[PDB]
Design a binder for these strands. Structure first.
Ligand SMILES: [Mg+2]
Ligand SMILES: [Mg+2]
Ligand SMILES: [Zn+2]
Lengths: 87, 150, 81, 186, 129
RNA sequence: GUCCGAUUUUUUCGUACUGGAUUUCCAACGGGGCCUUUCCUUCUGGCUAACCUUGAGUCCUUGUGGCUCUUGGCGAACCA
């Protein structure tokens, strides 16, 4: 939220779910954030550097949390031949 | 859902995506049209014609392969019945039940059903009135109806 | 579930759904070419025939109607087109 | 008389007469390839660039005919795509479109549905591929604001148009303003 | 019986965003549906959509993308004297800063930002935010 | 450019008003037009083709009326 002179007001811009793009409430204590390790030349997980996601309370409570990750994984290329678009 | 019952059945015919076809028919409209009127003179209603054409003579449905709906064929050939087949089979039924209603006067379930059928008839007939296929009055009458079947 | 190509449902799931409830509804019945072993005639019947279809003559019998698919008589040929 | 310009139906033009004599040429095969080729005449022809190094010839048929050009076509186009190499040949019946009735653009005595923008453009697309029926159809409305129609072609006898599909689109596009894309089973 | 169609449409779309669904079938397809869907798309509340040709009245598949709150229909389609476009926007839109009521003017179907500008008006269709 | 309280607080350091035309230097926005098979429907006006026609002429491996002048009829089209 901008203001009169393009100055940035509003005291915090919340996260958004990676699978429903819906706001993560300040008290969404089911909301999750998974950091996934990225690798280099064979094994050796590069520390402090992740491919990171965020799932909503809602999705996780629906049991869709896993399946959303598989579609989110392959998409950023973390899996191959797991998630299927057609079913 | 149903009109005169609590039924929600969907038993309906699914028509295929194919305004032309089939690649194996090959008999020309003129020869199937020749066949529709052949059965229509022998005293047959459009419904039970397409029944027989679909079962024995291959023809998937005459609206394609001839480009014209079966009743219009009869129409053009001057073989259109007096009252629409729709109504006839309604009226016929009502005529029936009404007879059974007379030898059986305590059949309260029959009386009730009779009301139903005659409601369908009138609601139907009121439509055929509206689209000029029945003369502006016509009316289903209890007494005279038995004359419209035979 | 949650995300899925509805435009492109799998042919195996699509053939499982109800007749009407396929992406674009379509029939499941077919037609036959049918003949009895003593005659070169080639009678063409429908799978869910409600008529006791005869051969060109010879007061025989090809199929008998039921509640669904008709039952072709005894010894006869048939190819599905 | 003359077997040349009479097989047309207008005074012009070059390309047409060239086809016309390319017609009589094939009419020199009397028993069938003449008996079934003398009644078949056409109206006019358009040229249109395709995406490949070729061009597209649009041969316009009167309409009550059409069914005639359909009894050959396979032959004709093939023999036409022999003599006129580097060309894609398709027969499109010229259909009259009547505008939508308005308080302004008004006309009496109704207006048959088969005389309408939608039904006619829908016929063109059916004529464009002629053989092989159309199995399904979609219209992608795009995130940015414009539509694309996805015509779904058969499996049977597709060999007669595999190569012209890139050409059909161009035809449709100059004809209408809309845009085409093709596909088969999936 | 089936009565609004645009309603059963918007319902389905809404009821999906509600359940975190990223796509909905729609049936049957109406022009009035499509024009509506366009108006939504052009402000990003939906994504791309795709008509389907059953030899009938249509189907539609819509891509949702979160961020849709409620698309609704107002039924009956009331007549709105242009000076009263204000009063509906003040009634069923979340903030003055954003949101859209969309109508049906003789100048076509459009959002109220637009009817405002072309200075036309007419019958309300529904709303998006 | 000049009206006006000039702000963080140092100097040639930074704020409500007006003017701005035509630009390829981007944008959004509305108004009126056309072309794309689409001004249709009615009526009046315009210019007039073609069509018939009187009269005088010419061609033909055929009365085939072709073609040109000419008398007064009829106003496709197109424009308003
Ligand atoms: Mg139902
Ligand atoms: Mg009722
Ligand atoms: Zn037999």
């Amino acid at each position: 939220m901008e203001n009169d002179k393009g100055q940035l007001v509003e005291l915090y811009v919340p996260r958004k779910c990676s699978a429903t793009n819906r706001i993560i409430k300040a008290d969404d204590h089911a909301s999750v954030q998974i950091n996934v390790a990225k690798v280099d030349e064979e094994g050796r997980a590069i520390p402090g550097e992740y491919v990171t996601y965020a799932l909503s309370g809602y999705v996780r409570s629906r049991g869709e949390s896993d399946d959303s990750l598989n579609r989110l994984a392959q998409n950023d290329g973390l899996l191959k031949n797991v998630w299927s678009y057609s079913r | 859902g149903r009109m005169h019952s609590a039924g929600k059945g969907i038993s309906s015919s699914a028509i295929p995506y194919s305004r032309n076809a089939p690649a194996w028919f090959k008999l020309s409209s003129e020869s199937v049209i020749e066949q529709i009127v052949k059965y229509a003179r022998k005293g047959l209603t459009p419904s039970q014609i397409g029944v027989l054409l679909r079962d024995a003579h291959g023809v998937t449905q005459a609206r394609v392969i001839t480009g014209n709906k079966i009743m219009r064929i009869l129409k053009s050939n001057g073989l259109a019945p007096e009252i629409p087949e729709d109504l006839y089979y309604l009226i016929k039924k009502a005529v029936s039940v009404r007879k059974h209603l007379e030898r059986n006067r305590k059949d309260k379930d029959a009386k009730f059903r009779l009301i139903l059928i005659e409601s369908r008839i009138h609601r139907l007939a009121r439509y055929y009135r509206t689209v000029a296929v029945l003369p502006p009055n016509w009316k289903y009458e209890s007494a005279t109806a038995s004359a419209l079947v035979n | 579930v949650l995300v899925q190509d509805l435009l492109h449902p799998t042919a195996a799931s699509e053939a499982r759904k109800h007749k009407l409830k396929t992406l674009v509804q379509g029939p499941r019945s077919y037609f036959l070419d049918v003949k009895c072993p003593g005659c070169l005639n080639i009678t063409t019947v429908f799978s869910h025939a409600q008529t006791a279809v005869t051969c060109e003559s010879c007061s025989t019998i090809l199929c008998t109607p039921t509640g669904g698919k008709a039952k072709l008589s005894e010894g006869t040929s048939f190819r599905r087109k | 008389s003359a077997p040349q310009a009479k097989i047309l139906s207008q005074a012009p033009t070059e390309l047409e007469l060239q086809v016309a004599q390319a017609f009589v040429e094939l009419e020199n095969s009397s028993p069938e390839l003449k008996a079934e080729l003398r009644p078949l005449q056409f109206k006019s022809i358009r040229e249109i660039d395709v995406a490949g190094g070729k061009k597209a010839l649009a041969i316009f048929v009167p309409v009550p005919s059409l069914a005639g050009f359909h009894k050959v076509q396979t032959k004709l186009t093939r023999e036409l795509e022999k003599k006129f190499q580097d060309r894609h040949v398709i027969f499109l019946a010229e259909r009259r479109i009547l505008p939508k009735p308005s308080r302004t653009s008004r006309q009496v005595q109704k207006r048959p549905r088969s005389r309408t923008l939608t039904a006619v453009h829908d016929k063109i697309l059916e004529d464009l591929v002629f053989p092989t029926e159309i199995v399904g159809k979609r219209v992608r409305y795009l995130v940015g604001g414009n539509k694309i129609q996805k015509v779904l072609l058969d499996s049977k006898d597709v060999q007669q148009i595999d190569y012209k599909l890139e050409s059909f689109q161009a035809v449709y596009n100059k004809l209408t303003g809309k845009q085409i894309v093709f596909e088969i089973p999936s | 019986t089936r009565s609004s169609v645009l309603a059963d449409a918007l319902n389905a779309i809404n009821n999906a965003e509600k359940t975190g669904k990223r796509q909905v079938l729609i049936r049957p397809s109406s022009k009035v549906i499509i024009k509506f869907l366009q108006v939504m798309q052009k402000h990003g509340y939906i994504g791309e959509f795709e008509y389907i040709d059953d030899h009938r009245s249509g189907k539609i598949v819509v891509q949702l993308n979160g961020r849709l709150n409620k698309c609704g229909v107002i039924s009956p389609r009331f007549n709105v004297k242009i000076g009263d476009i204000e009063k509906w926007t003040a009634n069923l839109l979340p903030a003055r800063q954003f949101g859209y009521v969309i109508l049906t003017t003789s100048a076509g179907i459009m959002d109220h930002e637009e009817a405002r500008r072309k200075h036309v008006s007419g019958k309300i269709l529904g709303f998006v935010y």
